[PDB]
Design an enzyme around this catalytic site. Structure first.
Site, mmCIF file in Angstrom:
data_model
loop_
_atom_site.group_PDB
_atom_site.id
_atom_site.type_symbol
_atom_site.label_atom_id
_atom_site.label_comp_id
_atom_site.label_asym_id
_atom_site.label_seq_id
_atom_site.Cartn_x
_atom_site.Cartn_y
_atom_site.Cartn_z
ATOM 1 N N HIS A 148 53.598 -39.253 -3.933
ATOM 2 C CA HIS A 148 53.123 -39.061 -2.566
ATOM 3 C C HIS A 148 52.835 -40.400 -1.925
ATOM 4 O O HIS A 148 53.214 -40.649 -0.790
ATOM 5 C CB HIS A 148 51.825 -38.255 -2.535
ATOM 6 C CG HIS A 148 52.021 -36.776 -2.598
ATOM 7 N ND1 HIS A 148 52.558 -36.135 -3.696
ATOM 8 C CD2 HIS A 148 51.713 -35.805 -1.708
ATOM 9 C CE1 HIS A 148 52.567 -34.830 -3.480
ATOM 10 N NE2 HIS A 148 52.058 -34.606 -2.281
ATOM 11 N N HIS A 177 39.323 13.360 12.912
ATOM 12 C CA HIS A 177 40.434 12.585 12.381
ATOM 13 C C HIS A 177 40.693 12.768 10.899
ATOM 14 O O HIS A 177 41.825 12.984 10.467
ATOM 15 C CB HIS A 177 40.193 11.096 12.622
ATOM 16 C CG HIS A 177 40.942 10.539 13.789
ATOM 17 N ND1 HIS A 177 42.295 10.707 13.987
ATOM 18 C CD2 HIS A 177 40.519 9.731 14.793
ATOM 19 C CE1 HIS A 177 42.647 10.005 15.075
ATOM 20 N NE2 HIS A 177 41.604 9.391 15.603
ATOM 21 N N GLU A 203 34.649 -0.057 13.409
ATOM 22 C CA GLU A 203 36.000 -0.136 13.967
ATOM 23 C C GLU A 203 35.859 0.024 15.503
ATOM 24 O O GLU A 203 36.430 -0.733 16.279
ATOM 25 C CB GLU A 203 36.858 1.014 13.408
ATOM 26 C CG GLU A 203 38.225 1.215 14.124
ATOM 27 C CD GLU A 203 38.986 2.506 13.701
ATOM 28 O OE1 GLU A 203 38.346 3.558 13.492
ATOM 29 O OE2 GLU A 203 40.230 2.474 13.608
ATOM 30 N N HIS A 204 35.098 1.037 15.912
ATOM 31 C CA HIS A 204 34.843 1.328 17.321
ATOM 32 C C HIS A 204 33.333 1.344 17.548
ATOM 33 O O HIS A 204 32.595 1.954 16.776
ATOM 34 C CB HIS A 204 35.385 2.712 17.702
ATOM 35 C CG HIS A 204 36.864 2.868 17.534
ATOM 36 N ND1 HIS A 204 37.419 3.678 16.568
ATOM 37 C CD2 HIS A 204 37.902 2.351 18.232
ATOM 38 C CE1 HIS A 204 38.736 3.654 16.678
ATOM 39 N NE2 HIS A 204 39.054 2.857 17.682
ATOM 40 N N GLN A 259 35.812 11.499 16.804
ATOM 41 C CA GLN A 259 36.059 10.631 15.655
ATOM 42 C C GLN A 259 36.136 11.455 14.369
ATOM 43 O O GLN A 259 37.064 11.316 13.566
ATOM 44 C CB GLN A 259 34.921 9.599 15.559
ATOM 45 C CG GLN A 259 34.626 9.057 14.164
ATOM 46 C CD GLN A 259 35.780 8.287 13.528
ATOM 47 O OE1 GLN A 259 35.684 7.869 12.372
ATOM 48 N NE2 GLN A 259 36.868 8.098 14.267
ATOM 49 N N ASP A 306 42.046 4.837 22.378
ATOM 50 C CA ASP A 306 43.070 5.294 21.446
ATOM 51 C C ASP A 306 44.376 5.494 22.203
ATOM 52 O O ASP A 306 45.457 5.311 21.655
ATOM 53 C CB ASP A 306 42.720 6.671 20.848
ATOM 54 C CG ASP A 306 41.530 6.641 19.897
ATOM 55 O OD1 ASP A 306 41.046 5.535 19.568
ATOM 56 O OD2 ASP A 306 41.090 7.745 19.470
HETATM 57 N N1 LIG Z 1 51.749 -31.129 0.151
HETATM 58 C C1 LIG Z 1 50.691 -30.215 -0.314
HETATM 59 C C2 LIG Z 1 49.301 -30.710 0.133
HETATM 60 C C3 LIG Z 1 48.728 -31.853 -0.648
HETATM 61 C C4 LIG Z 1 47.477 -32.035 -1.145
HETATM 62 N N2 LIG Z 1 47.449 -33.251 -1.788
HETATM 63 C C5 LIG Z 1 48.644 -33.784 -1.681
HETATM 64 N N3 LIG Z 1 49.447 -32.963 -0.995
HETATM 65 C C6 LIG Z 1 50.959 -28.826 0.291
HETATM 66 O O1 LIG Z 1 51.026 -28.676 1.534
HETATM 67 C C7 LIG Z 1 51.162 -27.623 -0.653
HETATM 68 C C8 LIG Z 1 50.076 -27.420 -1.700
HETATM 69 C C9 LIG Z 1 48.706 -27.300 -1.359
HETATM 70 C C10 LIG Z 1 47.708 -27.111 -2.331
HETATM 71 C C11 LIG Z 1 48.062 -27.034 -3.695
HETATM 72 O O2 LIG Z 1 47.082 -26.841 -4.652
HETATM 73 C C12 LIG Z 1 46.922 -27.773 -5.734
HETATM 74 C C13 LIG Z 1 47.170 -27.042 -7.019
HETATM 75 C C14 LIG Z 1 48.275 -27.361 -7.826
HETATM 76 C C15 LIG Z 1 48.515 -26.682 -9.031
HETATM 77 C C16 LIG Z 1 47.638 -25.666 -9.439
HETATM 78 C C17 LIG Z 1 46.530 -25.329 -8.649
HETATM 79 C C18 LIG Z 1 46.306 -26.019 -7.447
HETATM 80 C C19 LIG Z 1 49.428 -27.151 -4.057
HETATM 81 C C20 LIG Z 1 50.401 -27.340 -3.066
HETATM 82 N N1 LIG Z 2 40.991 6.689 17.135
HETATM 83 C C1 LIG Z 2 42.137 6.405 16.253
HETATM 84 C C2 LIG Z 2 43.444 6.313 17.063
HETATM 85 C C3 LIG Z 2 44.040 7.616 17.502
HETATM 86 C C4 LIG Z 2 45.327 8.050 17.458
HETATM 87 N N2 LIG Z 2 45.362 9.322 17.982
HETATM 88 C C5 LIG Z 2 44.137 9.642 18.331
HETATM 89 N N3 LIG Z 2 43.308 8.630 18.053
HETATM 90 C C6 LIG Z 2 41.875 5.063 15.546
HETATM 91 O O1 LIG Z 2 41.684 4.020 16.215
HETATM 92 C C7 LIG Z 2 41.833 5.023 14.005
HETATM 93 C C8 LIG Z 2 43.033 5.639 13.300
HETATM 94 C C9 LIG Z 2 44.363 5.233 13.570
HETATM 95 C C10 LIG Z 2 45.467 5.805 12.914
HETATM 96 C C11 LIG Z 2 45.264 6.817 11.951
HETATM 97 O O2 LIG Z 2 46.349 7.376 11.298
HETATM 98 C C12 LIG Z 2 46.576 8.794 11.341
HETATM 99 C C13 LIG Z 2 46.502 9.319 9.939
HETATM 100 C C14 LIG Z 2 45.475 10.197 9.553
HETATM 101 C C15 LIG Z 2 45.398 10.694 8.242
HETATM 102 C C16 LIG Z 2 46.363 10.309 7.299
HETATM 103 C C17 LIG Z 2 47.396 9.434 7.661
HETATM 104 C C18 LIG Z 2 47.456 8.947 8.976
HETATM 105 C C19 LIG Z 2 43.940 7.236 11.665
HETATM 106 C C20 LIG Z 2 42.859 6.649 12.336
HETATM 107 ZN ZN LIG Z 3 51.628 -32.866 -1.153
HETATM 108 ZN ZN LIG Z 4 41.163 8.797 17.647
#
Ligand SMILES: N[C@@H](Cc1c[nH]cn1)C(=O)Cc1ccc(OCc2ccccc2)cc1
Ligand SMILES: N[C@@H](Cc1c[nH]cn1)C(=O)Cc1ccc(OCc2ccccc2)cc1
Ligand SMILES: [Zn+2]
Ligand SMILES: [Zn+2]
Ligand SMILES: [Zn+2]
Ligand SMILES: [Zn+2]
Lengths: 432, 432
Positions: A414, A256, A321-322, A253, A355
């Site tokens: 509504h 890495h 993670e592991h 680990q 892995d």
């Molecule tokens: N048909 C609606 C669901 C629904 C709730 N009551 C009547 N209809 C839907 O699925 C989408 C939705 C969900 C939450 C929501 O948040 C309310 C809100 C409005 C403005 C500012 C902040 C928060 C706004 C839209």
């Molecule tokens: N045991 C590893 C999986 C594994 C791959 N080869 C050997 N072991 C795991 O589950 C976690 C993990 C996954 C991707 C990863 O990215 C590689 C990387 C390293 C540094 C910079 C950029 C990218 C890094 C860690």
């Molecule tokens: Zn609605």
């Molecule tokens: Zn590994």
């Protein structure tokens, strides 16, 4: 190395501290916006700037010809090992495919849950030395299993260099297109699209600080898996284990990243000492122990508990993670430790196997994210659509309640969309 | 209102344009960091500043006493309607609970998939007029069904005012704690915790620009559902519908927000005209048509196609939060239209029913996010852990392949964690 004792009256404070833990934003914001507004033009610009590559000559897309040659250059046993991994990962992920659910309830309302694959996904694969073919298989195979129509990979080629094994893995995993680009610019290209790269609907694959910041910006425009955090392994083990094996698992680990964290939680101090000695010795038998050494010194840790019942809440807070569980009656702890990306059971299950060839996905939740997320699965490449169908009887039965709530919410439009239907309908229900 | 014709040689350009579509960041970054570093102290500060409330007097937590009184004040039919909705939402979500999967493959490797509920979740509920009890049920019930141990709600009380129905819904849905706070400060309190508010592992619930920006910052530290986008409804209908009903469905959506979008896609221009006339008339019969009117004028749209086969790819690009399908042989289109948060089938299924009592969750993917995400479900409040167990035979069988890939990746410590076990083991396998 760092040792915490649950005995300690200050254990909790120390443990909590142990569990804790910039202007790149400004730069990434500009890079992403410019690629969005300017396209291919900006991609090449940033690619020269950061990868010292001239894509106008090398071309952005990797060719099937270049992929064919990568296969030739690869040792037969390496290609075969990658195929075995691909097959095992595919079989395991296939089992997790979701099943649709359409049914009719007691009132006769038809309710449904249907799943479809995301149409296009982009996989980000770091370049250079961090470029792992195993990661390509892990990230791409679930998409292929899920039925994703278009799977794209972007992998930067610093100084024009690409790991041929990454190209080999890509083909094996069903990757459709491959582009030689990376960084915030590649993330921007995938999210907004350019003349050469048609946009995708979701981006998966950990990257550096620039990639992470870019992913945070585009989230909402495209789906994203999660923002990569420091990698870790928590090993819970009793004295009835080979100290050399445990040390090896901790060091695997550690190699890495210099920020990788390896933790041993045990109830036997002497054993903890034995493991430490093994880590020191192996740190010398192995070569290129520059990173591992740094990781173990700076982030390694031993946590001493009285018994494993005590290890349970601590392991849950670590949310590794592991998690390797090497104690007697190991299976009995699996259900008790709810926060863990992947659990490896017994002395013959080094995490390394996961892995590569176990079958489960190694793209796992890091930095305590196991408290709320799962490792990559076919579900991450698919989405559910709800289905609802009401007949006149059903609307007559549930409509009044709907109208009541709508009016209490001040949403008259509504209420009217239901009322306008019921008003007409009601004239057929005057007997009850 | 805005009409697009697929006929038009410029249709594609216009359609693509139709589908397209700040320093708050700086401010939110400071608010979040200060709450993180200072706690309750900063919460009250920001609460006075933005909600004109003095929490040192009103207290941060709402009391069971204050919740009890909210129930009393509520009309019996409103409490009963909310209970019917709660029950229908619960029954439907219960059906979606994941099943664990433990098995043994042909090589004898034990592979497992286990699900657990997230331990604590916070639900953000806007205050004032946007404060909907229906939303409380939709956001909280799946968590309760999933088995979330601690469900917290934060709802700001501008000028000290809370919607009593929100408190009523909260109790019905199994909400444990309720705090009178909102904005980026509340999101910060939930993610990092304060002396009064212990942190949660995931935050769900759409909010304004300040909330959205705060959620983007804390993502990774806590899980987040998605960043709220403008709400919409796509109605695909033929001439064999009541124009008044269709107009009502379009206006129901429109009354939500001035940025809400209602779209009619049809193959009959005359019918499109009939619906428009109905929208105009109803816009006068209904009261408080300030928002709806603004929404329809500024974002309403009619898309004319020759036939519905043509509507399919267009509907898939729109990827609507809500999709009403009112055409003959409606069921035949459901599978063809893959991108939609929820689909409502037939003339008797106004989307409004789904917002309230159908059973499915109304917290749905908006702003084209249906291309990659699903509406809220119990899965959003749970996580999967992978389980793997290899015996000596299995490691002997899969280890060489693992080692081969590790070495090809230059990860010698990884290869050694397998090799160290195999070296010893191999001495028992010299017969094959
Ligand atoms: N048909 C609606 C669901 C629904 C709730 N009551 C009547 N209809 C839907 O699925 C989408 C939705 C969900 C939450 C929501 O948040 C309310 C809100 C409005 C403005 C500012 C902040 C928060 C706004 C839209
Ligand atoms: N045991 C590893 C999986 C594994 C791959 N080869 C050997 N072991 C795991 O589950 C976690 C993990 C996954 C991707 C990863 O990215 C590689 C990387 C390293 C540094 C910079 C950029 C990218 C890094 C860690
Ligand atoms: Zn609605
Ligand atoms: Zn590994
Ligand atoms: Zn104990
Ligand atoms: Zn046609």
């Amino acid at each position: 190395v760092t040792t915490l004792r649950q005995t300690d009256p200050d254990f909790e404070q120390k443990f909590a501290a142990f569990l804790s833990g910039e202007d790149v934003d400004r730069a990434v914001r500009e890079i992403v916006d410019r690629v969005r507004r300017e396209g291919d033009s900006a991609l090449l610009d940033y690619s020269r700037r950061f990868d010292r590559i001239d894509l106008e000559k090398t071309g952005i897309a990797v060719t099937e010809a270049e992929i064919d040659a990568a296969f030739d250059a690869a040792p037969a046993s390496t290609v075969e090992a990658l195929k075995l991994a691909r097959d095992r990962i595919e079989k395991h992920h296939a089992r997790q495919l979701p099943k649709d659910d359409r049914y009719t309830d007691a009132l006769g309302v038809e309710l449904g849950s249907r799943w479809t694959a995301i149409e296009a996904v982009g996989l980000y694969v770091p370049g250079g030395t961090a470029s792992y073919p195993s990661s390509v298989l892990m990230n791409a195979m679930p998409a292929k299993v899920a039925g994703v129509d278009r799977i794209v990979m972007v992998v930067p080629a610093p100084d024009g260099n690409l790991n041929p094994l990454v190209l080999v893995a890509a083909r094996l995993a069903g990757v459709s297109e491959i582009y030689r680009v990376g960084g915030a610019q590649a993330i921007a290209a995938l999210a907004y699209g350019t003349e050469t790269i048609r946009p995708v609907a979701k981006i998966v694959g950990p990257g550096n600080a620039y990639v992470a910041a870019a992913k945070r910006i585009v989230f909402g425009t495209v789906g994203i898996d999660m923002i990569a955090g420091p990698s870790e392994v928590l090993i819970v083990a009793d004295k009835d284990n080979n100290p050399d094996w445990i040390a090896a698992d901790l060091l695997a680990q550690a190699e890495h990243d210099t920020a990788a964290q390896s933790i041993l939680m045990t109830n036997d101090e002497a054993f903890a000492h034995a493991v430490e000695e093994a880590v020191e010795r192996q740190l010398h038998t192995l070569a290129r122990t520059e990173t591992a050494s740094a990781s173990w010194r700076d982030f390694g840790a031993v946590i001493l508990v009285k018994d494993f019942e005590d290890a349970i809440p601590l392991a849950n807070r670590i949310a590794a993670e592991h998690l390797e569980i090497a104690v007697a009656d190991a299976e009995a702890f699996v259900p008790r430790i709810r926060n863990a990306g992947s659990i490896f059971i017994g002395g013959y299950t080094p995490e390394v196997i996961g892995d590569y060839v176990g079958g489960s996905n190694h793209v796992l939740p890091t930095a305590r994210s196991a408290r709320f997320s799962s490792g990559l699965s076919v579900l991450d490449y698919m989405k559910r659509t709800s289905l609802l169908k009401l007949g006149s009887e059903q609307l007559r039965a549930l409509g009044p309640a709907a109208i009541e709530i709508a009016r209490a919410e001040g949403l008259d439009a509504h209420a009217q969309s239901v009322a306008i239907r019921l008003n007409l309908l009601e004239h057929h229900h005057h007997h009850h």
